[PDB]
Amino acid sequence: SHMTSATIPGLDTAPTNHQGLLSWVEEVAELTQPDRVVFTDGSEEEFQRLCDQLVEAGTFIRLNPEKHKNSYLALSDPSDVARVESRTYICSAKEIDAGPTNNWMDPGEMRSIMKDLYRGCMRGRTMYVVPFCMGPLGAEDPKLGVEITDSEYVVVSMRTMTRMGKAALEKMGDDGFFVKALHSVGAPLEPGQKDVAWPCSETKYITHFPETREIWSYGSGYGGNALLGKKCYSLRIASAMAHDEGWLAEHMLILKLISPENKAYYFAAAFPSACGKTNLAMLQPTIPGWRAETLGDDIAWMRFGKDGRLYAVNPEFGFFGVAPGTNWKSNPNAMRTIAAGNTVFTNVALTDDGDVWWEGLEGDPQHLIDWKGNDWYFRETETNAAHPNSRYCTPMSQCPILAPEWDDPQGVPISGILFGGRRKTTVPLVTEARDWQHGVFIGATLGSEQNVRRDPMAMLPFLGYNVGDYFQHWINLGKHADESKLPKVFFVNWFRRGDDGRFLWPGFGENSRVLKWIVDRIEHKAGGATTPIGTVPAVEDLDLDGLDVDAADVAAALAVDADEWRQELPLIEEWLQFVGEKLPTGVKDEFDALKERLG
Numbered sequence: 001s002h003m004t005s006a007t008i009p010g011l012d013t014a015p016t017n018h019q020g021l022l023s024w025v026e027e028v029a030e031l032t033q034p035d036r037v038v039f040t041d042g043s044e045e046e047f048q049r050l051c052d053q054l055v056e057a058g059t060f061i062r063l064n065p066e067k068h069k070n071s072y073l074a075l076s077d078p079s080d081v082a083r084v085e086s087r088t089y090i091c092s093a094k095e096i097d098a099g100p101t102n103n104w105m106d107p108g109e110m111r112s113i114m115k116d117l118y119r120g121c122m123r124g125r126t127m128y129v130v131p132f133c134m135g136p137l138g139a140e141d142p143k144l145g146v147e148i149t150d151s152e153y154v155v156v157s158m159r160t161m162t163r164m165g166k167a168a169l170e171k172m173g174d175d176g177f178f179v180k181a182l183h184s185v186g187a188p189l190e191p192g193q194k195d196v197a198w199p200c201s202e203t204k205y206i207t208h209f210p211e212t213r214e215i216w217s218y219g220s221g222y223g224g225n226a227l228l229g230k231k232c233y234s235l236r237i238a239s240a241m242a243h244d245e246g247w248l249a250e251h252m253l254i255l256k257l258i259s260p261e262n263k264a265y266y267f268a269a270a271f272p273s274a275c276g277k278t279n280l281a282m283l284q285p286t287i288p289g290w291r292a293e294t295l296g297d298d299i300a301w302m303r304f305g306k307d308g309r310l311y312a313v314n315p316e317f318g319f320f321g322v323a324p325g326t327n328w329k330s331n332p333n334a335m336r337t338i339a340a341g342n343t344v345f346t347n348v349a350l351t352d353d354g355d356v357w358w359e360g361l362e363g364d365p366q367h368l369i370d371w372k373g374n375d376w377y378f379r380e381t382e383t384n385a386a387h388p389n390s391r392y393c394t395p396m397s398q399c400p401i402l403a404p405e406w407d408d409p410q411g412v413p414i415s416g417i418l419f420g421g422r423r424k425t426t427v428p429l430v431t432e433a434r435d436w437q438h439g440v441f442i443g444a445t446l447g448s449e450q451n452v453r454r455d456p457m458a459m460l461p462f463l464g465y466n467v468g469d470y471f472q473h474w475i476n477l478g479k480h481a482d483e484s485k486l487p488k489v490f491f492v493n494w495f496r497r498g499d500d501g502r503f504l505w506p507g508f509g510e511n512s513r514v515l516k517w518i519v520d521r522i523e524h525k526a527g528g529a530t531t532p533i534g535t536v537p538a539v540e541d542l543d544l545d546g547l548d549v550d551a552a553d554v555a556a557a558l559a560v561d562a563d564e565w566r567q568e569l570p571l572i573e574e575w576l577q578f579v580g581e582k583l584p585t586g587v588k589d590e591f592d593a594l595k596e597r598l599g
């Protein structure tokens with residue numbers, strides 16, 4: 001009962017304008033043997049049809065519309081939320097081009113394994129062909145993709161997370177290049193066999209072929225394993241493209257900050273997971289006259305404009321945020337974005353009146369159904385009501401502080417790039433780099449206590465090629481740029497603690513005071529101390545007006561202690577050794593220069 005592609009339902013009515021796409025779709029369908037093939041158009045009628053089917057399958061339940069319009073709750077197989085870094089691969093032709101931060105396999109060996117897994121994997125299922133565009137549809141070189149998937153959950157989430165469907169398919173023209181992204185949950189069905197709400201496999205691979213810009217995923221239906229724009233395209237494949245094409249694909253929020261003189265500044269900031277991207281991206285300044293708007297909280301693609309400045313675009317179309325921790329007091333703008341509805345929640349808890357809840361959210365609900373479908377009771381049940389890494393998936397357009405520039409293909413000119421992580425000691429609240437090459441060193445040696453883990457530019461899990469070559473790429477882009485037009489680089493730490501365990505700096509909205517110093521430095525309106533690690537403000541250089549904080553604590557937050565930094569050196573040295581043969585001389589130079597300044 002194997003079917004030739006031309007007899008599989010849906011392929012006789014397939015779009016024919018792009019023969020490369022059609023031939024690829026035919027080849028994949030011949031291999032995976034779906035019951036039918038559907039090309040998705042991204043329309044609202046399609047979205048509701050797919051949602052109805054997800055409700056029927058039990059994958060979704062419809063939330064109370066009086067509290068969230070057009071919103072759904074999905075509960076996954078508990079086995080499909082586990083970390084799968086070890087199953088994530090960069091399959092470059094040579095191992096060195098994957099490098100020490102990546103998992104490599106010979107691409108021939110990998111294709112042999114995965115093509116075997118894919119054979120017949122879609123039996124009993126619909127195969128969706130999902131065209132999408134990463135970034136605004138009006139770009140010079142629009143980065144397009146097509147994800148083939150057997151998961152309706154994936155289609156609905158891709159509609160929110162990318163510009164999906166008709167417009168992207170048309171942008172491909174008759175022979176445009178696109179990233180081929182193949183996905184299966186790896187759970188074939190027999191005719192008449194009852195499905196489960198969340199199909200998946202015990203066998204998982206998330207594989208990237210940098211040379212051909214291809215992504216092959218098998219066995220997980222969850223998050224960045226299955227929504228292939230989110231990390232696989234946005235960072236892994238795109239970093240390889242950016243390497244070859246002279247631009248940057250980075251793990252950065254994009255923030256627009258407006259000063260009391262009504263001038264806008266744009267910042268890109270790279271922090272590792274759980275280090276404050278979402279809170280900073282949706283900053284509410286605490287000092288009069290300062291306003292903030294968001295362009296993104298996860299991925300930034302930066303390209304030089306004709307004027308010589310670096311311009312950032314957010315290639316995504318939605319927010320895919322961690323729900324626990326998000327609440328009305330820490331981040332009301334996130335909550336307001338979610339409140340507007342059109343949201344899919346995954347693995348959060350269900351209230352008695354059809355609302356959702358997660359740890360950290362206001363409300364103290366007395367009874368919930370938890371993320372496994374079991375009864376949960378306030379101050380009694382010893383298990384989390386929502387999965388600790390549960391998610392909301394919501395349109396960016398619903399964010400009340402969305403910058404008007406958010407859908408501009410040209411993007412926004414970046415004045416400053418920020419790097420930061422969680423450091424209990426050593427690293428000051430804010431430091432400005434000495435120059436671009438020093439800034440590259442600061443990003444390259446970014447540490448976070450998540451033992452201090454080095455997470456260079458917050459890209460440790462996401463580089464599409466050798467980490468050393470990636471540092472060289474950063475060095476190259478600055479070397480060939482107009483120095484006066486490059487973003488200035490800053491190093492922040494919201495997380496320094498005193499001996500009694502408390503945070504020296506209050507953070508959150510008060511980070512606007514740090515950003516004010518950064519703006520002033522960009523405008524040459526602020527001073528600071530010249531220290532061995534860069535320029536660091538004194539307490540008197542910061543606007544602490546109206547801030548109920550002990551000045552000694554702010555002083556401590558800003559201290560540069562030579563002894564602490566001397567203990568930091570061998571940790572940095574161990575890391576630069578780990579980077580391996582491709583460590584750029586320019587990065588080693590900065591290490592040497594830091595060691596010299598410290599004495």
Ligand SMILES: Nc1nc2c(ncn2[C@@H]2O[C@H](COP(=O)(O)OP(=O)(O)NP(=O)(O)O)[C@@H](O)[C@H]2O)c(=O)[nH]1
Binds near residue numbers: 278325494
């Ligand atoms: N002490 C302190 N904690 C902060 C600050 N900003 C954010 N956090 C805390 O950091 C944790 C995660 O913050 P979040 O903004 O979600 O970081 P994130 O980088 O977006 N996580 P992810 O990127 O994986 O979605 C939250 O518990 C939040 O309370 C800050 O300025 N100071």
Ligand SMILES: [Mn+2]
Binds near residue numbers: 277278321322
């Ligand atoms: Mn976040």
